[model samples]
Target chain A: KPRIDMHSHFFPRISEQEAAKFDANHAPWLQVSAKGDTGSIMMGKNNFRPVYQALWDPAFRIEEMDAQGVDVQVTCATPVMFGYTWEANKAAQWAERMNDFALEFAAHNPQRIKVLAQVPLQDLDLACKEASRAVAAGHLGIQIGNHLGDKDLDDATLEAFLTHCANEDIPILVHPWDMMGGQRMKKWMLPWLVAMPAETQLAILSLILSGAFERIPKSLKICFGHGGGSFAFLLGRVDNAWRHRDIVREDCPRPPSEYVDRFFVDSAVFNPGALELLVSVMGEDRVMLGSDYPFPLGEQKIGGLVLSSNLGESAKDKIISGNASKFFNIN
Target chain B: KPRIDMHSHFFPRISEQEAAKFDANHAPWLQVSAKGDTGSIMMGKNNFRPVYQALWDPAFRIEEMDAQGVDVQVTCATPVMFGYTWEANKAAQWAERMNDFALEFAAHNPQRIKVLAQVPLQDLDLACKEASRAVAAGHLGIQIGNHLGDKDLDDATLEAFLTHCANEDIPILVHPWDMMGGQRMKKWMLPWLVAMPAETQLAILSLILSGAFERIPKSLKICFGHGGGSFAFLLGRVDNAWRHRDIVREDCPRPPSEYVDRFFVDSAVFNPGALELLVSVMGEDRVMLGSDYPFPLGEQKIGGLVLSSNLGESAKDKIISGNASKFFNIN
Candidate 1:
């Protein structure tokens, strides 16, 4: 059963007691008050999100997986716990604890779960070093936020980390978190709906327009953690801009469409028609299932959209599980 | 004879001598140096964009129009000159000058050209009053920027102006100007490439999410000056967000798709596939031929993309000439 989903997340076991003991500064402090084995997660004084037992419990996760028809899932820490702006040493310490929790969780159902390690991206050398150690310790991939503060992935400092993953033949899942356009859009969860989609588009464009895709090892396998966010839909405009503007093409030189096959995406977009458009632009083989399960903003019923899409069954198979296995070298 | 194009521009006649005599201020000053009858427009000290005589001369505009196969054009001032930030009185003065210049230029070719008057949107009364007078002065429409500085079209001050346009049945062309992301994108003309597209999306969403669409007159015709600029392609995500977030639908109470048929767009998206997607989303009658002629970034050959798309001949005819003729009630 190759129904693999490469875009899911996890949270570590941390009690409010443990969080309260740590630095009680402005940075978000996660405090969990468990109702036996399941409850909501709190950051600072407010509830971050209502959590199901499936979040940190391997058995509960499998229950969710079986019910949702998912055979395998690759997991990362809940993005809110990233602490990207935290002081390096403190962030590194938290990353270690989160990564260890993840390894243990996956060990509970090793065949059904794969872990994606996190790093303190504020420090690049430390980031790469931890990433190297994590992969060596059995994490299959690295999950990174699209941008850290003001710098995007194409920042010169990230070349080493980006290159390191490529050299190690590791996959990187680029997820959107703490999306930009801060105060201008406080209402309507626009930060999630609008800014999140835009963050990935910018991240994708950074690699394409900055010529980083050409600089890095061609073997690097990167997948956008959403349905590639409006990138596929806006490809025509991107290509047209490349053709008309010398500055846009000065570094990338080639049209963005030429690099379409080099990138990968997950079927996290909400509807069948959206999936159809993404498949048409990204190609059938490039898309894999990534329902962003376990969240309200995420698609419900796991592979339902992909499985019931207007796409041919062959394409549906690739999205549901066929591609992730090969992309991540799932065995 | 109905090959109508709704997205072209005109410039007021000016001279370097005129600019040299005016107040030398921080605001952009137009300096036009003529090569007898053809030249470029300079803003402040830098060349803003070159102007063929087509921008100011009726004969030259006809020369370009015949070569491009456009029978009728709705004229608007170049978006850069909207002067939304200038003192209300000065902006109103300039608007009157620009509006009169446009009417004169169109007067020379009354059968082939219609005018879209500009207004000092910084003042609601002046904007609405000027718009009323401009339409009475034979301007068929009004061209307004998507946002005046930090205030988007749905800002409270704009309600009267918007309602005025609806009551007067004067169409509004929402143009993207001084696109957001100012300093963050001084390179590669990213302001135009990235911010312009995003601006229209925000403009459209403002109307939809803020309930302005429902509150405004039902007959108001608002057309995006670009091929709807990623709006149609991203509508699925917008609709999904509407369903998931209480804040997003709190005011609108309906999915954005319900209002998709209410808006209009021009076929300036450079490629046929984009037009296909836009038409599919906005409906055939809602799209019109808009090449953004004479600008390098605009689609070339005027009616070419619409005429040669994979769409049915009926759709092509509607986009090329059929819709706009009726949209403005062109005599």
Candidate 2:
């Protein structure tokens, strides 16, 4: 069976001159080589991560996708390009540029390259406007950061945007970005390894605890990146809190785990036992293949886990293709 | 048939007048009543969480313990009392005082109680000296915070102290405290709900990625509180990183999950599904019953999950009673 990847990322290449003129504090500052196949991601003047042709080249991405056994790939902005902290108009414009870049990139292989749009979530009006525009413009769905800094997903500020997706029947992908533990947790890439997953779980809980899951329209399909963060694994603890504390349960009527089907997760977690644990908590129907493609931490062969696992054929089929196929309206 | 709870906590009682003299920035600021059944835990002048008799009253704890199906209980300083950021001498004195309090408190029922010491972990000399003195004073083990401000568990500065624990045959309980996300995560107890678990995983990864598990004496019986944080659940992601990134495996010799046996976890995760996942990654024998007793978020009717689980009698026996009995060398 063919596999579809939901956690793959894409970036818009910026020439050295274009990036050098950008804001030092807010822009990605990724100086992609104008003619070469590699680039460096920077923060102010310091290099953070290096990238290869697959980050922007459509041909390169397709080659890797075919090599890795993924028949289709869903593309979203890398977390760094989120531009969430930038001034409102600037961020909105950046979002538009990134969205257009993705739509055109997918033109190279529209059947194999599915597109998800980005928005400037820091401003709700712009987020709502951008959400509608992008989804209306040939984008299958939209991707967003878990939070706009301290305002968690449960905050009242993001309600309209969430509602827009629901009313439009547009899928929303909640990606973890700009985790809170900044400088104190810099060692061992703790931001990515620990805080990133924690932030995603936090986002999941905020929605559950704040009763957003209850209020959001049933048509709104939301999937959390990185296997729904750490929500599936630590769910029992969340349920425990829901049971014992009035403050925890005041806004929710049911145990946290009972709302499991309310959200979807990707198969980005990379262990046999780990996949089982994720599937046990959230059914195979709610999970789809996601390799975090083109990143070192991503799974090597997109659907290697489900393809090799002891799961019955149907279960594996749902995760690697069927679930996301239906969710994203893929062929 | 008796159940042992290794995650119970205690705090020394202090009068409002006594607490008023403490430095606002460095003290617990808990105005535990000199003679009352309940009091308030304050952060400087604001009430954070309210407390009840079990926090300081031995009789109340025993009565609750009996009702909760717990037999022998292990006592450790509450994470709030860690005093890790205080001046070295101040924290050391506080540690000694708290260790003495835990020792005396356990004296109320020695056979039914076990004591773990507290130490000033910010300073290596002070932490080492306090560990020795407290163990000599009858503490069966020591409890230390996962990180000291910005310094993680893998910091080279902590090697001497870890080595000392190993050489002395001390069982160390790595508790999550002073989590890094400070002010931004203050809502709905995000610190406890999310960052708390994430920090424990961070602590585990730090040790594994830094090669501390290989270099530290194997005799160091290290256990993590809060079901070993989120470590067991996210082990696959960490393993994925180890497999793909040389920087991730630079200090470590093997994948992160391969080091599961080097640590121990508690049965404090509130859900049975969570317990199985914890055990699946780490063995049942490596898990001991822990209830985070007297805290609202802790499991009520401690040992309830194991008793009601589908596991055979032996698995139940190891988790609720046998494992801890052997690890703490309790009768």
Per-structure clash totals for the candidates: 0, 0
lDDT of 2 by residue, B223-304 (tens): 8988888888788888888887888877899877888888898887777777887888888789998877776435456787
Residues B1-331, model 1: lDDT tens digits: 5799899887767655554443344233444454555566775566767666667777878877887778898888887668787789878877887788789889988999888999999998898889988889888989998877667766888766888889889889888777654544555555665666777777788788888888899879888978777677777777777876677888887888899877888887766666777787888888888867655534457777778788889988888888888778885
Instruction: State which docking tier applies to candidate 1.
Output: acceptable
What are the per-residue Cα lDDT tens digits for candidate 2 across A84-201? 8788998898888889888988999999998899998888889888888988888999999888867888888776678878898889999888787766665556677898899889
Clashes of 1: 0
Give the Å error, residue B115, model 1. Answer: 2.0
Residue pairs whose backbone atoms clash in candidate 2: none
Per-residue lDDT tens digits for candidate 1, residues A1-331, read: 4799898888877766466554454334434453546566676566766676677788889998998888899988888788887889888877877788899999989899999999988898788888988888989989998887667768877666788888989889999887665446656665676667667877788788888888988888899977877777677778877887788988897888888867898888775556777787889999999877666677767887777778888888878778999888886
Worst 10 residues of 2 chain A by lDDT: A13-22
